[PDB]
């Protein structure tokens, strides 16, 4: 996609993550673990539901129309009846084809976008206490126990607390 996170700087997805679409993995002194990010996951799902509901919106109700199959050869009038129906069908078939192509390109791009949004939000949260490795992971330059990691994930990480510890570890 256009943002280069999904199938880009993030090598691959996690089959292990069944409780969410986007999220976090960590290593610290206490071990490893995984958590879904509810907010980014929901933003993507809401947009996809939005487009799905727009697409399946009932619009067409027709009653008496023209005949479209014929048991006799008749010539001019029948040629025109068939041509009209064939023209309609081709235009509608084209619309269907284009619609899905555009929709799907956009769905791939907006999901890539949400991944990138989460990544940039996390980087901004960590301020000068971490560095972008380039593969979707931050190296955090201080002791971050399980309580600290959860603080990053639920938006309550105060960067000033750990700044001196981290700044020292970074600049050698």
């Amino acid at each position: 996609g256009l943002f280069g996170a999904i199938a880009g700087f993030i090598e691959n997805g996690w089959e292990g993550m069944i409780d969410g679409w986007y999220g976090f993995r960590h290593q610290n002194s206490e071990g490893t673990g995984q958590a879904a990010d509810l907010k980014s996951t929901q933003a993507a799902i809401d947009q996809i539901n939005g487009k799905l509901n727009r697409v399946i919106e009932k619009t067409n109700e027709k009653f008496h129309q023209i005949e479209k199959e014929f048991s006799e050869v008749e010539g001019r009038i029948q040629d025109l009846e068939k041509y009209v129906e064939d023209t309609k069908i081709d235009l509608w078939s084209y619309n269907a084809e284009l619609l899905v192509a555009l929709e799907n390109q956009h769905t791939i791009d907006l999901t890539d976008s949400e991944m990138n949004k989460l990544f940039e939000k996390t980087g901004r949260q960590l301020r000068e206490n971490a560095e972008d490795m380039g593969n979707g992971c931050f190296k955090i330059y201080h002791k971050c126990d399980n309580a600290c990691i959860e603080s990053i994930r639920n938006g309550t990480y105060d960067h000033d607390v750990y700044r001196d510890e981290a700044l020292n570890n970074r600049f050698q």
């Binding site: 996609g1 999904i6 199938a7 993030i10 090598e11 691959n12 997805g13 996690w14 089959e15 993550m17 069944i18 969410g20 679409w21 986007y22 999220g23 976090f24 993995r25 960590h26 610290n28 002194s29 487009k51 799905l52 697409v55 399946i56 919106e57 067409n60 109700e61 027709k62 009653f63 008496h64 005949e67 479209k68 199959e69 129906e85 069908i89 081709d90 509608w92 078939s93 269907a96 084809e97 899905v100 192509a101 929709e103 799907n104 390109q105 769905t107 791939i108 999901t111 890539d112 989460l118 996390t122 971490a130 593969n135 979707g136 992971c137 931050f138 955090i140 971050c144 990691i149 990053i152």
Partner: protein, 321 residues
């Protein structure tokens, strides 16, 4: 000794291929079908009023072929014509058959109102062994075959004004004998004529004597015509022979009514959309079942499948094998 925090996204083991602007096939975590491609094979009897023609075409029901008498005064949203249908009365043609079928189908009713035409000096209620009604000879229930009385057939001249606030449809005809002996035997005059008119328009038909192929005991034919009389207009019928007279008029309506050719059976269920293949669901925007449809239907397209991506790009782990 610090910590790593990795951002990521989900993947699934079994993804789905979709089309995009740049790729004719690319894998996403999930997708949904936008083309309805199957039917139950059955026409749901609700919510549209379905009238099964069984052995009858709409036109035979209209004219009143005896085996179609059960359709008298019937109404429908969708009249269903079956491929087994057959005619079993006097052999006939309808110039512009398709138009008469269309306008009746669209009107949605066969309500017939008998009117007191006075046919002075002719014999009424003629019939034929081509059109048996019970054990004896008969005719179309809505038509009145007029023939000579004594040794004369006078100039018939009758009128019927429309003083109602609705349009009247009159079905009438002209008889084409096979021989000159038949023509003079039935109508005295060697050549007949039928003129049916309103204020604004007129039709005149000259019969043509001659053999046509034998159908149910006869080489002769009837040709069927129609005339709509609007409120404040008047019907006049003028003939010196060969008139197959109306007995009254059909009440016309406008609305959602139509007709469909189908052999699908009618079943107890609910479906807004009907095709000749049967009813189809209408939760999807497109369908590939049949270009012929009735009701609230997905639009017909040529594709048998179109997948709308409902998830992100699916990227499973780099594969060791």
């Amino acid at each position: 000794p610090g910590a790593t925090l990795c951002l990521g996204h989900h993947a699934v083991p079994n993804g789905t291929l979709v089309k995009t602007i740049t790729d004719d096939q690319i894998e996403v975590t999930n997708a949904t079908e936008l083309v309805q491609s199957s039917s139950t094979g059955k026409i749901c009897n609700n919510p549209h009023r379905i009238l099964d023609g069984i052995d009858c075409t709409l036109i035979d029901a209209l004219l009143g072929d005896p085996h179609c008498d059960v359709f008298q005064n019937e109404t429908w949203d969708l009249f269903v014509e079956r491929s087994k249908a057959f005619s079993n009365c006097y052999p006939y043609d309808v110039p512009d058959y398709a138009s008469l079928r269309s306008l009746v189908a669209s009107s949605g009713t066969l309500e017939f109102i008998t009117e007191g035409f006075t046919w002075t000096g002719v014999t009424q209620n003629g019939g034929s062994n081509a059109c048996k009604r019970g054990p004896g000879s008969g005719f179309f229930s809505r038509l009145n075959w007029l023939t000579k009385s004594g040794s004369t057939y006078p100039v018939l001249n009758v009128t019927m004004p429309n003083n109602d606030n609705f349009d009247k449809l009159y079905i009438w005809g002209v008889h084409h004998p096979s021989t000159n002996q038949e023509q003079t035997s039935l109508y005295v005059q060697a050549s007949g004529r039928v003129t049916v008119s309103t204020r604004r328009s007129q039709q005149t038909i000259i019969p043509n004597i001659g053999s046509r192929p034998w159908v149910r005991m006869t080489s002769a034919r009837i040709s069927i015509y129609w005339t709509i009389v609007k409120p404040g207009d008047v019907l006049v019928i003028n003939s010196n022979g060969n008139l197959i007279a109306p007995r009254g008029y059909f009440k016309m309506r406008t609305g959602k009514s139509s007709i469909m050719r189908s052999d699908a059976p009618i079943d107890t269920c609910i479906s807004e959309c009907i095709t000749p293949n049967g009813s189809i669901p209408n939760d999807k925007p497109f369908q590939n079942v049949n270009k012929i449809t009735y009701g609230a239907c997905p639009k017909y397209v040529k594709q048998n499948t179109l997948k709308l991506a409902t998830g992100m790009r699916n990227v499973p782990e780099k594969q060791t094998r």
